[PDB]
Amino acid sequence: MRIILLGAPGAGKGTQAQFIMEKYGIPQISTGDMLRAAVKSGSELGKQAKDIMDCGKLVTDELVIALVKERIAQEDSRNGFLLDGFPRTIPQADAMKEAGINVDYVLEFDVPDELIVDRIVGRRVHAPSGRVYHVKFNPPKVEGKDDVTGEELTTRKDDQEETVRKRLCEYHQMTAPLIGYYSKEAEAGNTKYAKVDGTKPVAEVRADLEKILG
Ligand SMILES: Nc1ncnc2c1ncn2[C@@H]1O[C@H](COP(=O)(O)OP(=O)(O)OP(=O)(O)OP(=O)(O)OP(=O)(O)OC[C@H]2O[C@@H](n3cnc4c(N)ncnc43)[C@H](O)[C@@H]2O)[C@@H](O)[C@H]1O
Numbered sequence: 001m002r003i004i005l006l007g008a009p010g011a012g013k014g015t016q017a018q019f020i021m022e023k024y025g026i027p028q029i030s031t032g033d034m035l036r037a038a039v040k041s042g043s044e045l046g047k048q049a050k051d052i053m054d055c056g057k058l059v060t061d062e063l064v065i066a067l068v069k070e071r072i073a074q075e076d077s078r079n080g081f082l083l084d085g086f087p088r089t090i091p092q093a094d095a096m097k098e099a100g101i102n103v104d105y106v107l108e109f110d111v112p113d114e115l116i117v118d119r120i121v122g123r124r125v126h127a128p129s130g131r132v133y134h135v136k137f138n139p140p141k142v143e144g145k146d147d148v149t150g151e152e153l154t155t156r157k158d159d160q161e162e163t164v165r166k167r168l169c170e171y172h173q174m175t176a177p178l179i180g181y182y183s184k185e186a187e188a189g190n191t192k193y194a195k196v197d198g199t200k201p202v203a204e205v206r207a208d209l210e211k212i213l214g
């Protein structure tokens, strides 16, 4: 299974990926998460991505395209994978076609930018796993601590209210176009396309996916 999660910042993608990953045994490929910890090491394959990411801007296609091609290669991606955050641009999308990588589903996460900003404020994450929470909507059994590792949670540098704004705008301008892209790709039998309401509680959304995935 090869799936694409399309949607804006704070839409639920990270969260929903957990469920899916274990639900279908496919590796969760998250360009943002991967980029977060690539700079968290220094590695140029990262580093010069901290500034762009913190400013709310997008990383170059080349970079994420290369990053994903490598990731997909691994032996745990031979049975499929979950693309969360990629592709985020037509060039990244086309890059996949030239690569001949057909995708089973492209899930559209529908969420009003209005929720976004109230949603990313209370977002506390656990860097390493990608696992994420909300100090109100989806809290961890223990405050400031990861449920699985019990390791302390953090907050993203880029979750700054204003950067969140930029990020959203960036989305609607660069990524949003993929909604139309993959729709066409759908009206051409190159992938099954499906929208989801990301404003339901995590569990409700988790139901919708199950419903759409099996
Ligand atoms: N291909 C590419 N090209 C160029 N640049 C790229 C790139 N890929 C990545 N990047 C760079 O990477 C950087 C990081 O962005 P990135 O991390 O890659 O994606 P994002 O734009 O930041 O979207 P978010 O991670 O903020 O939200 P999410 O939907 O992914 O996860 P979740 O919703 O659970 O987290 C949101 C919050 O919502 C809460 N939540 C989730 N579901 C629900 C629900 N159903 N109800 C209530 N609350 C919920 C959660 O608790 C959580 O706290 C970007 O700046 C970008 O430039």
Ligand SMILES: *CC(=O)NCc1ccc2ccc3cccc4ccc1c2c34
Residues within 6 Å of the ligand: 054, 055, 056, 057, 165, 166, 167, 169, 170
């Ligand atoms: C550090 C940084 O983000 N620099 C680029 C930049 C500067 C000012 C802005 C003012 C208003 C904006 C609204 C939407 C997106 C966006 C993206 C980059 C901006 C910027 C933005």
Ligand SMILES: *CC(=O)NCc1ccc2ccc3cccc4ccc1c2c34
Residues within 6 Å of the ligand: 166, 168, 169, 170, 171, 172, 173
């Ligand atoms: C919706 C969106 O992302 N808009 C792009 C954008 C808007 C306003 C700006 C104001 C000042 C700026 C200075 C440097 C870079 C930059 C990049 C995108 C901007 C923007 C920018």
Ligand SMILES: [Mg+2]
Residues within 6 Å of the ligand: 013, 014, 015, 030, 032, 084
């Ligand atoms: Mg995410």
